Write an enzyme that holds these catalytic residues in place. Structure first.
Site, mmCIF file in Angstrom:
data_model
loop_
_atom_site.group_PDB
_atom_site.id
_atom_site.type_symbol
_atom_site.label_atom_id
_atom_site.label_comp_id
_atom_site.label_asym_id
_atom_site.label_seq_id
_atom_site.Cartn_x
_atom_site.Cartn_y
_atom_site.Cartn_z
ATOM 1 N N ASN A 300 29.099 50.267 33.988
ATOM 2 C CA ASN A 300 29.334 51.658 34.347
ATOM 3 C C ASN A 300 30.736 52.024 33.902
ATOM 4 O O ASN A 300 31.712 51.564 34.500
ATOM 5 C CB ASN A 300 29.184 51.867 35.851
ATOM 6 C CG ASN A 300 28.916 53.299 36.206
ATOM 7 O OD1 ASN A 300 29.061 54.185 35.371
ATOM 8 N ND2 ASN A 300 28.532 53.543 37.452
ATOM 9 N N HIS A 339 33.175 50.250 48.546
ATOM 10 C CA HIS A 339 31.764 49.905 48.421
ATOM 11 C C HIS A 339 31.167 49.550 49.775
ATOM 12 O O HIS A 339 30.047 49.966 50.099
ATOM 13 C CB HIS A 339 31.593 48.749 47.439
ATOM 14 C CG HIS A 339 31.574 49.176 46.007
ATOM 15 N ND1 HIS A 339 32.720 49.495 45.311
ATOM 16 C CD2 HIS A 339 30.549 49.341 45.140
ATOM 17 C CE1 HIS A 339 32.401 49.837 44.076
ATOM 18 N NE2 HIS A 339 31.089 49.751 43.946
HETATM 19 C C1 LIG Z 1 23.229 46.340 36.157
HETATM 20 C C2 LIG Z 1 24.242 45.648 37.038
HETATM 21 C C3 LIG Z 1 23.703 44.439 37.761
HETATM 22 C C4 LIG Z 1 24.745 43.668 38.549
HETATM 23 C C5 LIG Z 1 24.211 42.451 39.282
HETATM 24 C C6 LIG Z 1 25.292 41.609 39.932
HETATM 25 C C7 LIG Z 1 26.242 40.959 38.942
HETATM 26 C C8 LIG Z 1 27.625 40.632 39.493
HETATM 27 C C9 LIG Z 1 28.513 41.825 39.633
HETATM 28 C C10 LIG Z 1 28.368 42.853 40.447
HETATM 29 C C11 LIG Z 1 29.350 43.967 40.583
HETATM 30 C C12 LIG Z 1 29.118 44.862 41.796
HETATM 31 C C13 LIG Z 1 27.952 45.820 41.671
HETATM 32 C C14 LIG Z 1 27.874 46.849 42.786
HETATM 33 C C15 LIG Z 1 27.025 48.062 42.451
HETATM 34 C C16 LIG Z 1 27.077 49.182 43.478
HETATM 35 C C17 LIG Z 1 26.442 50.470 42.987
HETATM 36 C C18 LIG Z 1 27.390 51.363 42.230
HETATM 37 O O1 LIG Z 1 27.019 52.225 41.472
HETATM 38 S S1 LIG Z 1 29.091 51.061 42.617
HETATM 39 C C19 LIG Z 1 29.761 50.625 40.992
HETATM 40 C C20 LIG Z 1 29.931 49.114 40.914
HETATM 41 N N1 LIG Z 1 30.816 48.688 39.841
HETATM 42 C C21 LIG Z 1 32.029 48.191 40.084
HETATM 43 O O2 LIG Z 1 32.566 48.299 41.184
HETATM 44 C C22 LIG Z 1 32.718 47.461 38.954
HETATM 45 C C23 LIG Z 1 33.088 46.051 39.367
HETATM 46 N N2 LIG Z 1 34.367 45.642 38.806
HETATM 47 C C24 LIG Z 1 35.490 46.296 39.107
HETATM 48 O O3 LIG Z 1 35.617 46.971 40.124
HETATM 49 C C25 LIG Z 1 36.601 46.289 38.069
HETATM 50 O O4 LIG Z 1 36.057 46.678 36.820
HETATM 51 C C26 LIG Z 1 37.482 45.011 37.952
HETATM 52 C C27 LIG Z 1 38.169 44.713 39.284
HETATM 53 C C28 LIG Z 1 36.655 43.802 37.514
HETATM 54 C C29 LIG Z 1 38.517 45.368 36.890
HETATM 55 O O5 LIG Z 1 39.492 44.317 36.740
HETATM 56 P P1 LIG Z 1 40.831 44.691 35.986
HETATM 57 O O6 LIG Z 1 41.401 46.060 35.843
HETATM 58 O O7 LIG Z 1 41.270 44.568 37.401
HETATM 59 O O8 LIG Z 1 41.728 43.428 35.581
HETATM 60 P P2 LIG Z 1 42.177 42.920 34.144
HETATM 61 O O9 LIG Z 1 41.443 43.049 32.858
HETATM 62 O O10 LIG Z 1 41.443 41.668 34.481
HETATM 63 O O11 LIG Z 1 43.675 42.382 34.049
HETATM 64 C C30 LIG Z 1 44.700 43.215 33.483
HETATM 65 C C31 LIG Z 1 44.790 42.963 31.999
HETATM 66 O O12 LIG Z 1 43.661 43.595 31.330
HETATM 67 C C32 LIG Z 1 44.141 44.439 30.309
HETATM 68 N N3 LIG Z 1 43.163 45.491 30.050
HETATM 69 C C33 LIG Z 1 42.271 46.026 30.948
HETATM 70 N N4 LIG Z 1 41.512 46.947 30.405
HETATM 71 C C34 LIG Z 1 41.913 47.026 29.082
HETATM 72 C C35 LIG Z 1 41.479 47.818 28.006
HETATM 73 N N5 LIG Z 1 40.499 48.718 28.102
HETATM 74 N N6 LIG Z 1 42.087 47.649 26.808
HETATM 75 C C36 LIG Z 1 43.071 46.742 26.703
HETATM 76 N N7 LIG Z 1 43.545 45.954 27.665
HETATM 77 C C37 LIG Z 1 42.934 46.128 28.852
HETATM 78 C C38 LIG Z 1 45.496 44.883 30.835
HETATM 79 O O13 LIG Z 1 46.294 45.565 29.891
HETATM 80 C C39 LIG Z 1 46.034 43.533 31.308
HETATM 81 O O14 LIG Z 1 46.326 42.666 30.162
HETATM 82 P P3 LIG Z 1 47.780 42.684 29.466
HETATM 83 O O15 LIG Z 1 48.764 42.311 30.562
HETATM 84 O O16 LIG Z 1 48.026 44.081 28.920
HETATM 85 O O17 LIG Z 1 47.728 41.638 28.364
#
Ligand SMILES: CCCCCCCC/C=C/CCCCCCCC(=O)SCCNC(=O)CCNC(=O)[C@H](O)C(C)(C)COP(=O)(O)OP(=O)(O)OC[C@H]1O[C@@H](n2cnc3c(N)ncnc32)[C@H](O)[C@@H]1OP(=O)(O)O
Ligand SMILES: CCCCCCCC/C=C/CCCCCCCC(=O)SCCNC(=O)CCNC(=O)[C@H](O)C(C)(C)COP(=O)(O)OP(=O)(O)OC[C@H]1O[C@@H](n2cnc3c(N)ncnc32)[C@H](O)[C@@H]1OP(=O)(O)O
Ligand SMILES: CCCCCCCC/C=C\CCCCCCCC(=O)SCCNC(=O)CCNC(=O)[C@H](O)C(C)(C)COP(=O)(O)OP(=O)(O)OC[C@H]1O[C@@H](n2cnc3c(N)ncnc32)[C@H](O)[C@@H]1OP(=O)(O)O
Ligand SMILES: CCCCCCCC/C=C\CCCCCCCC(=O)SCCNC(=O)CCNC(=O)[C@H](O)C(C)(C)COP(=O)(O)OP(=O)(O)OC[C@H]1O[C@@H](n2cnc3c(N)ncnc32)[C@H](O)[C@@H]1OP(=O)(O)O
Lengths: 408, 407, 407, 408
Positions: A300, A339
């Site tokens: 998403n 959530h």
């Molecule tokens: C079809 C799906 C089936 C799933 C079945 C289960 C599977 C398991 C998973 C289940 C998930 C839950 C599902 C619930 C659903 C409910 C219903 C809804 O509709 S609710 C929506 C739910 N979706 C979420 O809530 C998203 C889940 N994930 C998240 O919330 C985030 O995306 C999260 C925490 C994972 C994001 O993590 P970051 O922002 O925290 O962390 P970072 O990448 O790891 O670290 C920072 C580094 O990343 C770079 N970075 C990040 N994005 C970048 C980009 N676009 N370009 C370049 N660098 C980037 C940064 O620059 C930095 O690196 P430098 O220091 O610069 O080297």
């Protein structure tokens, strides 16, 4: 760089579904869907004479529909009017006087209490006062979170602008109204106009989303509902909940796939077409994803984009300089709390371990495919464990809600 | 004219490593393993012990030592006497008293071989013991294979020696043995040699054939054996035949896909890997096919190769090319007769119209999707009609077998 | 040290084309064919129909599909797991924490393989169904063959890698498969390649093995099955045992010669011809042998090769060479234990003294003919004693089996 | 060149029987012989108590033995005396007078009537007057043919000598006596003396010939005699003579082999040793033979030598210059007439087709192995057909003698 652009286009499915082999797989899939429907129909009609097609479940779930119509109308009008004119009065007289922050703190507090009370409680109050049925309750909670994020974005996109001093004003109501319907959650005044609205195309997409919803609903009624009755009668501590955690895996997969398709693709693309949005990058090829750090491919994009940009950025900003781990755990905590709130108020059930266990399982999967382990044995194992584990915890959630949190 | 090998890797390997398709594939395998695990742990809890006991398999395989000794006979017989006869025909050509008497007598002897040793030997040994319709299938499979390879080993060399100096080349047997195991039905000496045989790779492919055969077995039994018994017992009134056609669809297409895979891809690749064959063009992309007249895309090429090159060309040579349509009708007739023989003998039932109605169905489908309609609506309708048609016709066939021959 | 291939053509082919011996041979074959033809036309006239009906063969062969699937299991198991285990042992040697822990664990796993998969698997599958003592023989034959080839494939490479740089050579499997079919029991890569395989020649050799097996069958049945039943029924009093020892002589030596031929010459040459093996040293001229200590001439060399090179050398390495006689006694013991196991398991009878009394008899015979006596009187006496001794001891054996275990 | 020399030595068997492999085959053969004897003995003793060893047959066949002793003595003395002194008187006064052939014709006629009457009839008369039993009758006919040939040779070696004119005389009686016992049939005065008589060796050879004769006789009594009783009772036109023409083939082979060995090897070698003859080439490796013309390897050299030298030579001499076919058919006719005479007078049976059918069969065999056909299939077929055909015609001969030429 930080921001939002319009490179990708269409979606991520319309790109493939005209690649010959994938296209034929898609058509075979549609054929199996329609033949499965005709099979269930003309194998439970000639055998039971009724041709049931039970319309019970949604007639109870949708519940009080005029109340959600009225409250959504007043909520849309609130979000459309009060933040707009509030910020309008705000910025116009920013630094004519009040050299300290008094003006700021005061009016920003007015805005904050507006959001929390009117847009936080008002919906929560009108959904817990009439004891709304989950489906319509879900509509209200969903639209309330949507409007909260859109308001926070409309005020996050323009307050660092006016203050860096000329003084950029608020935009036209004729563009704010549009943003309140754009398939996105990052406020921009710059949206590319596709050439023309294709009325036949949007009609086809509305037909597709309605047929997808009805097929989801029919598969549910036929395959997930009897399971629900048989976990309805004797739910406490049977060892035969296993019988159906091993019997809803496949329709759970089907529901996941079709709800993703319908909502993330047809709904959003049809609204984009009625608005000529331009980006249409509403999802990434999440199935190929491997890990969270730097390489996550969210399923998403709108929510992931808002989350990153408006939580992670400012959290690394405020917290500390090298404690990335702290800031990442903070965005996890924010997503988890919101959530759990959504699902709890939506299912009349405070059970906060669901999301955090989801994330532990995601750690597990990502790890077992992020040791440079392309070996298909591990990918197959990841997929089986994903399906099985999500079914397991879905049914344990439904059990705990239905038995131990029903009976004393 | 002439078939010459170029390509490799069938289609599935190359096609799969495209990432989207590879993940579709792993999802498919995950769904298969979860399906069988779930099915197992659902009927261990609602019935008791495991409900898979390999009942019908032992009745299907039946008289196996019979088939191993008749396979050794047929193989040895094909290996020696067509070859020996040909080498005898070879050295002494163009020294005869009458130019062709040697040919008349010699080709008569070879025809005698075909019709008696390979035309009757296997069919006699299959109808003597009234073999179970699975091992009977093995024997008729091997028989048509060996007959076609013999016809090819003769049609590939006779016209060579005949035209005329040292114009008479006859190939070593040590090549004939290799071609008797090659994955093709056009005799050649022109087979390249991948650098090695990859024992890990054939281990994987043989494990995979074993697993896919096991899995088709499980699915077939559990999902249509009860339906088979029901269409057996009360087969006359329309109720159960409708009930069966409308429940023989999903495991139908599943076993179809799985057997196509396990046999046209996995088995052939295991062997071609063991023999380092190279040209792994074992199936064209059947699913995208268009029509009949030109640019047809068969789902197995070996039989299509033989059919085209050894019936159509030659009925062109028999009838001047102005009545080509008439020539084309005969290859239809040859394919029809051979398939009707195979199916009848393997199923102890003389029902001719199966193949011709399948061909009329293919014609109607090609009319549906061809003419560059290409509209997804027509393509989806074609796929539903294919699945449903395969279902209904299998069921009418099994009905006419269960009912109006047992009755 | 080390066995290296040189010679060819066994002995019989080269020996035969000496004209006198070739005519002796043709006279022998003429006498055989006339004997069987005459025997047939004498009992077609004094009994009615043909008295050869292949009765005891079907009881001997018995559970054949069992032996084909256990042969595929044993063959596949020998082909993979000793090889896979060894290739695993191979790459990582001399990188361990403790120098030998890797060896202790790894060799333990390999010993586990030997004793369980090849030491118990075949013997368990043979004693489960209580297989007929002919197919049971096939299985124990294959089992000892595969055990010896595995012991050889390990003893031929382990001491190589161990001594120490690139000192660790491990051979392709595509060679291991070939050695699993070679006519020998010392693993090698050094096998030459006669220019071709001669299909007429293997056709002749296989026809010859088939005919000689058929002929030994005919002779054995007609000439000692009645004697077998008589020694079965009334086995206690001396009369019938004398009557049997003094009539089990001529067809005894006949079946002995014919089976030696058909197996040590014909079968091995058919295969070595199919695999172009070259060194056809499959038997030394047994009939001229002299004694034990030095210059012994075994009648099959493959087992003698294995025994010498993999028991005597190593018991030399275990005991300082001053007690060599003691070391020599153990190879006697190893040969004794392996033969007693083979014979008992294949004949469901624990009678140890057979092999040791055969060895004492061979010792007495060597005493008769050796010491350079060379007098034709002593040589003739040795041959009469050999024939008669083989007779009497076979009969005392079959008696103790028929009588004091059935009783 | 025409004549006789002393190159070959020993025999043709003593040459091989010390080649290692052939030697061991020989010892295995002896072992099988002795074990077959012990088997028959101690399997018909413990089963019938008698240990029969029937000495009936020879006690009747040898029959009147003193009469053959006396007639052989007078025949030896005749052949030793009358041709010697006759030729002595003959040559000494050859061309002192009688310039025409009168002396020659007269005395040569006296010699011719001597041979035909005294040496032809005298034996035939004393063998048909007492109706001798075949065995002793065979001894007499055999020795009579022997003495006829030896006399013809003693007078064929010396008459072309005296006439070519000094005048070579007759040799010493001390050498004529020797020639009357030499293992040969071509008169020479030149015989090489081997170093010494080996009394142990001649004792061993006499033991071997007596043991060979007794083993021949025992195998006969045990295996060919019961056949003879069962063709004795019902011999006329049964179709079960086939039963035993398929049941005496192997002992027929054994009798052939052992009579050849004994008489052609041990008897002749023992007499050579007692006389130190020197040549000892008493047989050729007949089994390898292929054809009659130019390549025949006779199984009997003495008779073949006499036959060639004293019949074929003079027949091509007298008959014609290029009619070799005529002369060869003539030597065939001579051998046939003498063989038929011998066998007829010996078995009281005139049945002259035996030898000529033998020669037709020899034509058959020689042809089927003289088309450059070394292929072992043809050699095996030749050997089987030889054994079978000789057994067939032996039993047809015995049948016709025993049934149709016994009963009216
Ligand atoms: C079809 C799906 C089936 C799933 C079945 C289960 C599977 C398991 C998973 C289940 C998930 C839950 C599902 C619930 C659903 C409910 C219903 C809804 O509709 S609710 C929506 C739910 N979706 C979420 O809530 C998203 C889940 N994930 C998240 O919330 C985030 O995306 C999260 C925490 C994972 C994001 O993590 P970051 O922002 O925290 O962390 P970072 O990448 O790891 O670290 C920072 C580094 O990343 C770079 N970075 C990040 N994005 C970048 C980009 N676009 N370009 C370049 N660098 C980037 C940064 O620059 C930095 O690196 P430098 O220091 O610069 O080297
Ligand atoms: C173990 C045996 C088992 C046998 C089983 C049956 C098998 C079939 C045969 C059965 C035989 C019968 C058995 C009866 C037994 C009864 C019992 C007894 O003890 S009685 C003795 C019986 N033995 C005979 O009677 C001998 C049989 N054969 C003969 O009688 C003669 O050997 C015969 C007729 C075959 C000899 O034939 P050639 O003299 O007539 O004729 P040529 O070779 O063919 O022609 C003349 C040319 O040969 C050259 N030639 C001849 N000998 C030569 C030499 N030594 N050196 C060089 N050139 C020579 C001449 O120079 C000429 O050729 P240029 O014109 O010169 O080129
Ligand atoms: C997983 C399967 C799904 C099952 C579902 C069933 C649905 C229905 C469909 C089918 C399943 C049937 C189930 C039976 C089971 C059988 C089992 C086997 O293993 S058999 C395999 C196929 N089974 C057949 O029966 C053979 C296919 N049958 C055919 O119709 C022939 O392939 C046929 C008749 C179409 C052969 O081709 P033409 O006779 O149509 O050819 P012309 O009309 O002469 O056209 C040839 C022209 O194309 C040019 N051409 C040049 N290169 C060409 C090339 N490579 N291929 C074709 N044409 C070429 C030539 O130059 C010529 O042109 P110019 O008109 O002469 O100028
Ligand atoms: C058709 C058959 C007839 C049957 C009739 C039976 C009659 C009785 C006879 C036997 C039949 C048995 C029936 C059983 C069935 C079995 C079935 C099979 O396929 S198994 C095959 C054989 N069966 C055995 O049991 C193995 C033979 N048994 C043995 O005794 C061994 O072969 C044995 C013990 C004799 C091995 O030799 P060592 O132990 O006597 O040797 P050392 O005493 O150490 O003498 C070695 C000396 O020779 C030198 N040498 C050099 N090169 C040599 C070479 N090529 N061969 C031998 N020695 C050599 C060495 O440098 C060493 O001299 P330095 O004293 O150390 O200085």
């Amino acid at each position: 760089e930080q921001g939002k652009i319009f490179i990708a286009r269409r979606s991520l499915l319309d790109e493939l579904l005209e690649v010959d082999h994938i296209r034929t797989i898609y058509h075979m899939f549609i054929a199996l869907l329609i033949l499965f429907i005709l099979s269930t129909l003309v194998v439970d009609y000639i055998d039971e004479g009724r041709l049931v097609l039970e319309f019970s479940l949604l007639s109870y779930a949708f519940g009080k529909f005029p109340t959600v119509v009225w409250t959504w109308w007043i909520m849309f009008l609130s979000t459309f009017s009060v933040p707009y004119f509030l910020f309008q009065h705000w910025a116009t007289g920013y630094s004519k006087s009040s050299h300290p922050l008094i003006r700021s703190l005061f009016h920003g507090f007015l805005f904050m209490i507006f959001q929390i009370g009117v847009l936080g409680f008002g919906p929560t109050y009108v959904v817990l006062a009439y004891t709304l049925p989950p489906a319509s309750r879900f509509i209200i909670i969903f639209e309330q979170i949507r409007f909260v994020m859109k308001a926070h974005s409309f005020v996050r996109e323009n307050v660092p602008r006016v203050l860096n001093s000329s003084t950029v004003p608020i935009p036209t109501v004729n563009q704010y109204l549009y943003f309140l319907f754009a398939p996105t959650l990052i406020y921009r005044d710059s949206y590319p106009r596709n050439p023309t609205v294709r009325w036949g195309y949007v009609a086809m997409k509305f037909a597709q989303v309605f047929g997808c919803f009805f097929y989801v609903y029919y598969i549910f009624e036929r395959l997930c509902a009897p399971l629900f009755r048989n976990i309805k009668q004797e739910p406490f501590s049977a060892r035969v909940l296993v019988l159906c955690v091993f019997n809803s895996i496949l329709p759970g997969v089907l529901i996941l796939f079709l709800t993703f398709f319908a909502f993330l693709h047809c709904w959003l693309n049809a609204f984009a077409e009625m608005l000529r949005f331009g980006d249409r990058m509403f999802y990434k090829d999440w199935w190929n994803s491997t890990s969270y750090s730097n390489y996550y491919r969210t399923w998403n994009v709108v929510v992931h984009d808002w989350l990153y940009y408006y939580a992670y950025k400012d959290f690394l900003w405020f917290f500390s300089k090298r404690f990335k781990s702290a800031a990442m755990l903070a965005v996890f905590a924010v997503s988890a709390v919101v959530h759990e709130y959504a699902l709890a108020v939506c299912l009349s059930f405070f059970y906060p371990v669901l999301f955090v266990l989801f994330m532990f399982f995601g750690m597990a999967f990502n790890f077992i495919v992020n040791d440079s382990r392309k070996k298909p044995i591990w990918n197959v194992l990841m997929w089986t464990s994903l399906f099985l584990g999500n079914g397991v915890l879905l049914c344990f959630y439904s059990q705990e809600w239905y038995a131990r949190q029903h009976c004393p």
